[PDB]
Amino acid sequence: PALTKSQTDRLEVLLNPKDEKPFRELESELLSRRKKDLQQIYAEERENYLGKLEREITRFFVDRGFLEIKSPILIPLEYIERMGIDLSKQIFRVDKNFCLRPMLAPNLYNYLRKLDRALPDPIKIFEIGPCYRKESDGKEHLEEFTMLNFCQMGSGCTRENLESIITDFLNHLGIDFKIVGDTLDVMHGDLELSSAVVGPIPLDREWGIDKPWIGAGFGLERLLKVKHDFKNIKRAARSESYYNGISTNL
Amino acid sequence: PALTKSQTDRLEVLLNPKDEKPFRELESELLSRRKKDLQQIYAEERENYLGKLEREITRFFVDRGFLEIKSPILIPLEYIERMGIDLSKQIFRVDKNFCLRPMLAPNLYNYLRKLDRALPDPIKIFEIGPCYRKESDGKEHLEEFTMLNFCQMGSGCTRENLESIITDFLNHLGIDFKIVGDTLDVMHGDLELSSAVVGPIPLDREWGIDKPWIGAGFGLERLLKVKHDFKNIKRAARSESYYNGISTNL
Numbered sequence: 397p398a399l400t401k402s403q404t405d406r407l408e409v410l411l412n413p414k415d416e417k418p419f420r421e422l423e424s425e426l427l428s429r430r431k432k433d434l435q436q437i438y439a440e441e442r443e444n445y446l447g448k449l450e451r452e453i454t455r456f457f458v459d460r461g462f463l464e465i466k467s468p469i470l471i472p473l474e475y476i477e478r479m480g481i482d483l484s485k486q487i488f489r490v491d492k493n494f495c496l497r498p499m500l501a502p503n504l505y506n507y508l509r510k511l512d513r514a515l516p517d518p519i520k521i522f523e524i525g526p527c528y529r530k531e532s533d534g535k536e537h538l539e540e541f542t543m544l545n546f547c548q549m550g551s552g553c554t555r556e557n558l559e560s561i562i563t564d565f566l567n568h569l570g571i572d573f574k575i576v577g578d579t580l581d582v583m584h585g586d587l588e589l590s591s592a593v594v595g596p597i598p599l600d601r602e603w604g605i606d607k608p609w610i611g612a613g614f615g616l617e618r619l620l621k622v623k624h625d626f627k628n629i630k631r632a633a634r635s636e637s638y639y640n641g642i643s644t645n646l
Numbered sequence: 647p648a649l650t651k652s653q654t655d656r657l658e659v660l661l662n663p664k665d666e667k668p669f670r671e672l673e674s675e676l677l678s679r680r681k682k683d684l685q686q687i688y689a690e691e692r693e694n695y696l697g698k699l700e701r702e703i704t705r706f707f708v709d710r711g712f713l714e715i716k717s718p719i720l721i722p723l724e725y726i727e728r729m730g731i732d733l734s735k736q737i738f739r740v741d742k743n744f745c746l747r748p749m750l751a752p753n754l755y756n757y758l759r760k761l762d763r764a765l766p767d768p769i770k771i772f773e774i775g776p777c778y779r780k781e782s783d784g785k786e787h788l789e790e791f792t793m794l795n796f797c798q799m800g801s802g803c804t805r806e807n808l809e810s811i812i813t814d815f816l817n818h819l820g821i822d823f824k825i826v827g828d829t830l831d832v833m834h835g836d837l838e839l840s841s842a843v844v845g846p847i848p849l850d851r852e853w854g855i856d857k858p859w860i861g862a863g864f865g866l867e868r869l870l871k872v873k874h875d876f877k878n879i880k881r882a883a884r885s886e887s888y889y890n891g892i893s894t895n896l
């Protein structure tokens with residue numbers, strides 16, 4: 397009569413946040429619901445949450461005067477050392493000289509330096525894309541995730557302006573937050589949505605940067621987790637197991 | 647007086663397709679032009695070609711009834727073997743059990759199988775994203791590229807329908823092509839834009855697929871190369887060296 401832990405685990409896979417003994421009937425009910433959810437997505441919008449969020453965020457920053465960057469995901473291992481990373485044990489190495497980027501900063505540093513030769517002050521850029529870190533199991537971490545990093549360099553690089561961009565950005569997405577403060581974290585309850593920095597910092601010199609700057613990095617899967625009230629960030633990930641938070645194991 | 651080969655190489659970095667002794671003046675002219683090009687992008691649209699193309703392609707397929715997939719880039723090595731790949735020497739391995747995906751097929755096979763339990767016939771899906779292959783130097787190949795793979799499974803999986811989708815798709819993008827024919831290549835002159843397949847094929851059984859299907863895979867950087875008349879596909883890649891085909895080394 398009482399559901400086993402394994403049965404409960406199975407039902408929880410099929411349970412969605414907005415949902416409101418014997419196991420087989422409960423399972424059948426949830427299977428029907430989830431099939432109908434996929435059918436509705438297929439019939440109507442057909443957009444993947446992670447893709448759609450990237451597009452929405454892209455529009456926000458492009459509209460605010462930030463240049464869209466698409467830089468390599470596979471980066472030189474040298475960039476890790478040059479980032480002052482002696483995270484060191486979290487790097488996915490590829491061949492002898494490369495790794496999967498654990499963050500967007502090194503390529504954006506290079507872009508800021510290069511673009512400063514061409515673009516008027518201030519320089520405003522952003523990137524959204526895959527980042528990789530070896531992580532311990534956890535409901536808030538993925539080994540394959542998607543970062544947004546925006547930054548501004550030159551005039552107007554104040555904490556006030558950084559907080560303003562963050563605030564406008566999250567109010568646009570409709571995500572509740574608190575900024576907890578040079579360095580700031582953007583929190584949703586106890587979940588970190590972003591780390592933000594008001595530069596300059598001593599690392600800049602290694603990258604040929606000698607101007608003020610502000611920037612922040614956000615995990616898109618974390619944003620989705622909060623927005624859609626997913627219990628586990630796995631529902632928001634690139635996945636074969638979940639589609640828009642709906643189990644594909646039906 | 648005569649430009650050296652190295653000087654010509656430098657000028658060719660700065661030359662754009664639409665452009666129409668002494669070296670320093672030629673260099674200065676091209677530098678000014680390319681800075682102005684970046685300034686215009688920054689002032690006006692601010693979109694990255696590779697990002698924008700992905701968005702345009704996404705809209706095309708979503709509008710045509712195809713479900714947008716975002717699946718893992720880091721995939722089990724087992725998937726390679728299960729794809730009948732004994733390309734074998736082109737795989738970027740990561741740790742003991744994983745690799746960077748060289749193609750979108752294995753994850754899409756899994757999606758087709760899973761979605762067949764939920765969605766009405768025919769099942770139409772697509773993915774756009776990073777793929778990785780170790781390649782010899784060449785003007786048409788990147789080690790890090792972006793694939794579009796669409797497919798349909800069930801009813802209507804005919805060569806005629808596959809050719810129709812391809813034709814509508816490339817006429818939409820404004821890319822000239824010829825389809826050269828079960829299996830088809832979509833050519834732009836001697837450059838392969840896509841390989842396409844009319845299933846079923848014997849590989850399907852390994853992935854739990856036993857329905858007719860059609861599908862095709864396109865390289866986005868190749869599409870950009872053709873569309874923008876880039877001499878080298880490096881101008882279309884995720885890069886720190888080129889932005890929308892414009893040298894960042896100014």
Ligand SMILES: Nc1ncnc2c1ncn2[C@@H]1O[C@H](COP(=O)(O)OP(=O)(O)OP(=O)(O)O)[C@@H](O)[C@H]1O
Pocket residue numbers: 499529531536537538539541542543588589590591613614615616617618
């Ligand atoms: N493994 C991960 N999975 C999902 N999102 C991540 C992961 N690592 C970082 N992020 C996201 O990227 C943002 C910026 O990266 P940062 O390096 O500041 O993370 P972090 O300080 O290591 O986070 P945490 O303390 O939660 O590990 C984080 O605020 C988070 O939103």
Ligand SMILES: Nc1ncnc2c1ncn2[C@@H]1O[C@H](COP(=O)(O)OP(=O)(O)OP(=O)(O)O)[C@@H](O)[C@H]1O
Pocket residue numbers: 749779781786787788789791792793838839840841863864865866867868
């Ligand atoms: N290394 C690469 N760089 C850029 N695009 C690629 C690369 N490999 C494949 N593609 C693109 O992906 C498409 C489908 O992949 P497929 O495995 O059929 O390529 P392929 O037959 O190996 O191509 P090629 O003969 O040019 O190496 C190709 O038609 C091409 O547009």
Ligand SMILES: N[C@H](CCCCNC(=O)OC1CCCC1)C(=O)O
Pocket residue numbers: 499500501502504505545546547591592593609610611612613
């Ligand atoms: N790099 C991640 C995310 C931090 C985002 C804030 N930093 C930031 O925007 O750096 C700018 C990007 C290129 C150099 C300046 C971290 O280590 O927390």
Ligand SMILES: N[C@H](CCCCNC(=O)OC1CCCC1)C(=O)O
Pocket residue numbers: 749750751752754755795796797841842843859860861862863
């Ligand atoms: N996989 C690449 C691209 C081929 C694209 C055509 N194949 C295709 O769409 O396969 C479908 C995708 C999942 C299984 C059926 C190749 O090896 O050529």
Ligand SMILES: [Mg+2]
Pocket residue numbers: none
């Ligand atoms: Mg961390």
Ligand SMILES: [Mg+2]
Pocket residue numbers: 588590591
């Ligand atoms: Mg942090």
Ligand SMILES: [Mg+2]
Pocket residue numbers: none
């Ligand atoms: Mg090849």
Ligand SMILES: [Mg+2]
Pocket residue numbers: 838840841
């Ligand atoms: Mg081919």
